[PDB]
Design a protein around this ligand. Structure first.
Ligand SMILES: NC(=O)c1ccc[n+]([C@@H]2O[C@H](COP(=O)([O-])OP(=O)(O)OC[C@H]3O[C@@H](n4cnc5c(N)ncnc54)[C@H](O)[C@@H]3O)[C@@H](O)[C@H]2O)c1
Ligand SMILES: NC(=O)c1ccc[n+]([C@@H]2O[C@H](COP(=O)([O-])OP(=O)(O)OC[C@H]3O[C@@H](n4cnc5c(N)ncnc54)[C@H](O)[C@@H]3O)[C@@H](O)[C@H]2O)c1
Ligand SMILES: NC(=O)c1ccc[n+]([C@@H]2O[C@H](COP(=O)([O-])OP(=O)(O)OC[C@H]3O[C@@H](n4cnc5c(N)ncnc54)[C@H](O)[C@@H]3O)[C@@H](O)[C@H]2O)c1
Ligand SMILES: NC(=O)c1ccc[n+]([C@@H]2O[C@H](COP(=O)([O-])OP(=O)(O)OC[C@H]3O[C@@H](n4cnc5c(N)ncnc54)[C@H](O)[C@@H]3O)[C@@H](O)[C@H]2O)c1
Lengths: 338, 325, 335, 337
């Protein structure tokens, strides 16, 4: 009936992918693996969520399986605690599609370990150095079932930028653009100044600081939108909020446009071919207004500004946790239909 | 030393007094704030959540505010008018830092000679040190404005890059700390609906005229911008996206700023800095070399830090100091 | 259903409306706030940083707020002076006084001049009588009590717990601390709060000691505990949800299991919906939007000995209280 | 001057070095941390989000850490061993080692430092079996001949015990219950994440008030034996980066007004407990004690009394910097014995 899914890494993305799966009812999660969270702890972490509130439904442990229900449907989920993804028995569980959301198996070689356990497809919940990247509504139809078995759903930021960039580029042509994302705190950061050896700024106390950071998210848009390769790059500022982020894209347009024309192009995409991916708003919103929003990108029409018809700053919101999680589920549904 | 009066003993008012004491280039002789009594004034100056305890002694004696750091001692007269007798106090320069007299000439009737508005003014002339302060003309400028914190950050950076490479056009974002105009939880801000939303919970899009204001200090009409208010108590950052006339390497950009930083407001760093590293920094603008990014030699994104409290408050003192000369 | 008016469309005012719409046990027909026009009211009611988007539709039509989940049609006014609000004309029988600035009986009595009959002040009052649902609400007297108080969020949390513990074991004496979320009276950065200096210091940076009469007030709503309770507060940087920390001496010694049972029995019985019991490993955000007055945190409690214990109780200081305001109106309307 | 080595260059490790440089009563000669190489150590010491830029100069030269305040210079050998048994404290000359990793708190684990040539080890935390000391309270019970592995207890215990001593000596504490409202630390998480033994501690720190267990009040009974079994308590972790506060609710033997209690604390603060216990009557908040070197600052006005025999006493502490100064003081003390 529905594609059967395994989740490796029951973290912010892993747990919220499960939440999104239950609400959307387009896939069936049959297994979860996390060596740092036993079944009773899984129940607790799924039940209570500081950002997204109490799970709207019931969750419990029965027979060494996670039982998750929202009244309508019930998911019986096998639970494993293996550190080596090769040891996860996905095949026995019937997990055809595996969400690789631990944050430490992001290459094709490491992610392929899931195939040894009997999985057919793996979706890395992060950018990959070598696995092909996909963004729903932008290049997912370029997916090639016979040759793409290990794929990436890119990053939260790329999923915000790419649908907007695609709309603007299609309509006006982006010669070049520069992106800033003001990004909420994530699990890789620290509560007080601590060790972050590869990235020193990322170790500084998240709650105290505005933190400059490099991201390949804008550059990666050139990978899901080939015509913009080399035409986009960017960076981030990490700020002390628990969730929801915003993209700030400064771009030069080939064909001149008024803000009214820009709004119209976005609304058309939002109301049509990009429904559920790209949304449009004219309200006086702030970040918390998008906690739990399922879209990849919410264009903030009122926050946008133009210097002249060929030079503009475009603003788009995203729930980096829940928006992205909804796209992982959607990406699985798409490739399973292939 | 020029004698200064302060109206509104808030974040800028109090920190202006602090910078004044450290720099010892002015003599504060009076303060007015009708919502703050002299005993309350002692406390607010003494303890500061952001900048720590005042380094020195402060107390009330003889109905006057007594402020000392060992080196100097300032005796400050206190008033509570919402009518301020500035002339009697000898207060030649009045900083209008209530934020609500952006109206300002009322201070001259009390005996003031020059007035510094601690904010942009709709009708008063604007000046920022290091950019247009030498354009001041003593005979005609008696009611003036020292612009905003953000403007003092962008323009010095803008000047160096433009002088060296030429900026055709640019768009600015400032990631900005929480201020007193904001709310602790969702509350009324009738003119600016987003600014009423809980500051500690939110990233808040906000408008700023700072880039436009740079057009007053050849770049008029070539820059505009906006802001995001974020949940930090102080220190903000400028994110300047620009098109260059003459192509440049990042090494070339870093070199122009470093050379300027070591010479003629703006500093250069190549360290792995974050916002708290600039709490108490007195510069108007601090260029973040490693955080800058270029797409190509003619399209770059430039990052500059500023303590929006302490930089500007220091400038309030300096604009006073320059004009007295 | 009782017809209700709301004065002051702030955190409590707006959430009393949310609680009213969800409960459908009262009908809100009018609102007054001179700093928030009808269009702004829609925005403030629609979007909420703490409690999320309104679950329903809200709009302005004909100078009226249209709020539906059932449909409530609400007349809107904008007077600073409560004497000018036509509660009688709009048909507002009970007025929620949630402005924070008319906490005296004389000041609050202005709503009676506009044609309202019964008034519930959303705060402690210096001279108006205070009530806490599940504790002393039956002492309400329709003939003589027309201007009343629903006490404080903190009092609504402590008093029900205090009642259970005192009834069951006897409280000789107790001292309360509430670790309290930031509220609208505080400041984003160090600013003027002339009457209360610590409250002026930047909320996001600080733990702020503050006085509260909430604990003493339990002695007004439970007379036998008068002079036996007091306390204080620490304001901390969270946007909502607070916790009570009650250290008390018991007359009759008790184990914690026995203490737990006394609370659970009450929670499963006469105090259902008022006092709740939990044994989970909860933290503050887990009570965001919780409608209870008090949630006893069984696992966070500690005892030194059977007669000296520390009891922990959570409360959504915004939404728990807002629901009690509604329940109280429904209650006195049942009178 | 006593020569000191530091294991674990974390919040305590680093601020102990800062406090050492400022007090200049010890000489730091070695540091070990396998997750922080020498160049990174420079950065982490130089810049501090909480306590500001290091007041002095810091650099890397010759695989050694060079730390100076103009007057004095500390030349620090740098190591990166995971096993503390492999650290050459003797070769570097580290007689006293601050054990500030958080993962070697038992005596057996702490004893690993002895094999490297260290003589004394100070565990920067409570210990299950190593003896605990609080400066100004029970450090004179230290026994040089037999105590080689010791504990400086916890930050919270260093706040409570000096106040507990003063109130108890003067009025007699029959029994007491403590709450500490505590700043966030490094064991917590930025967003909801795994904390398998302590589920509440895994919940996002910036969003939550978090109940937590602490043995700090009970531990006062070990450094003040007469209060054994007479104190216990718990904690709430709140979203601030530093500075915490003790909330002590106690029953008194001899009835007292708050003014008498204040007077008793004032006397101790200006006399035998100077530099350890401080008294203030100001309208303070937590940030006013950022960087404060005292173990405990009594907040006289925040105190409240129910009756002459039942009171609630409020005391502040910089859990990072107060405790760090005491570590140095304890080294300075035992070295003088
Ligand atoms: N959080 C976001 O906003 C966000 C958005 C989009 C993408 N992502 C990406 O998704 C991935 C997950 O990020 P997150 O925020 O959910 O992180 P997280 O730290 O919340 O989740 C990581 C989880 O993986 C588990 N894990 C660790 N090692 C494991 C192993 N060997 N086997 C199985 N499980 C293991 C951990 O116990 C933890 O529960 C990251 O790569 C991140 O870059 C994150
Ligand atoms: N905070 C910053 O980063 C910053 C930087 C540059 C400029 N500014 C501007 O400077 C101005 C001051 O801002 P602030 O941060 O000190 O705000 P603030 O709230 O800290 O200061 C306001 C003070 O003015 C006093 N006041 C109120 N009404 C008054 C009256 N009728 N007469 C005299 N005094 C009165 C208040 O008692 C209060 O102490 C604002 O216009 C602000 O936009 C702020
Ligand atoms: N927020 C809480 O957690 C909480 C809990 C329990 C009780 N209370 C009490 O309830 C009251 C409401 O607090 P709040 O947090 O909603 O404050 P708030 O700032 O959210 O609400 C204030 C509102 O009252 C309005 N107002 C101001 N003057 C007015 C006038 N003259 N007439 C009508 N309306 C006016 C303002 O426009 C504002 O919208 C407070 O007194 C508070 O002490 C608050
Ligand atoms: N932070 C406070 O407020 C505070 C106060 C008093 C005591 N303490 C105690 O101090 C100790 C350290 O706490 P912290 O807050 O500095 O934590 P932290 O995480 O800031 O410091 C721990 C440091 O130890 C290092 N480390 C980890 N494993 C190691 C190993 N095998 N060998 C050597 N070094 C290793 C880490 O790289 C890290 O830098 C803990 O026991 C804590 O209980 C903390």
């Amino acid at each position: 009936s529905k594609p059967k899914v395994g989740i490796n890494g029951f973290g912010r993305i892993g747990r919220l992918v499960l939440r999104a799966a239950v609400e959307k009812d387009t896939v069936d999660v049959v297994a979860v693996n996390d060596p740092f969270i036993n079944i009773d702890y899984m129940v607790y972490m799924f039940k209570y969520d500081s950002t997204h509130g109490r799970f709207k439904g019931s969750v419990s442990a029965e027979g060494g399986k996670l039982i998750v229900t929202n009244g309508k449907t019930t998911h019986h989920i096998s639970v494993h605690n293996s550190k080596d993804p090769a040891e996860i028995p996905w095949g026995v569980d019937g997990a055809e599609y595996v969400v690789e959301s631990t944050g430490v198996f992001t290459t094709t070689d490491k992610a392929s370990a899931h195939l040894k356990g009997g999985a057919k497809k793996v979706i890395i919940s992060a950018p990959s150095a070598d696995a092909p990247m996909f963004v729903m509504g932008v290049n997912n139809d370029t997916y090639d079932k016979a040759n793409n078995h290990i794929i990436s759903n890119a990053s939260c930021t790329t999923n915000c930028l790419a649908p907007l960039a695609k709309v603007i580029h299609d309509k006006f042509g982006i010669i070049e653009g520069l992106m800033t994302t003001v990004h909420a705190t994530t699990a890789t950061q620290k509560t007080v100044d601590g060790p972050s050896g590869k990235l020193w700024r990322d170790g500084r106390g998240a709650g105290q600081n505005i933190i400059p950071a490099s991201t390949g998210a804008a550059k990666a848009v050139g990978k899901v939108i080939p015509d913009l390769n080399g035409k986009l790059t960017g960076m981030a500022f990490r700020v002390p909020t628990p969730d929801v982020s915003v993209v700030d894209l400064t771009c030069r347009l080939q064909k001149g446009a008024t803000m009214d024309e820009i709004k119209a192009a976005v609304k058309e995409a939002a109301n049509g071919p990009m429904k559920g991916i790209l949304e449009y708003t004219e309200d006086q919103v702030v970040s918390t207004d998008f906690t739990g929003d399922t879209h990849s990108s919410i264009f903030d029409a009122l926050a946008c500004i133009s210097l002249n018809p060929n030079f503009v700053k475009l603003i788009a919101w995203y729930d980096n946790e829940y928006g992205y999680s909804n796209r992982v589920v959607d990406l699985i549904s798409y490739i399973a239909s292939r």
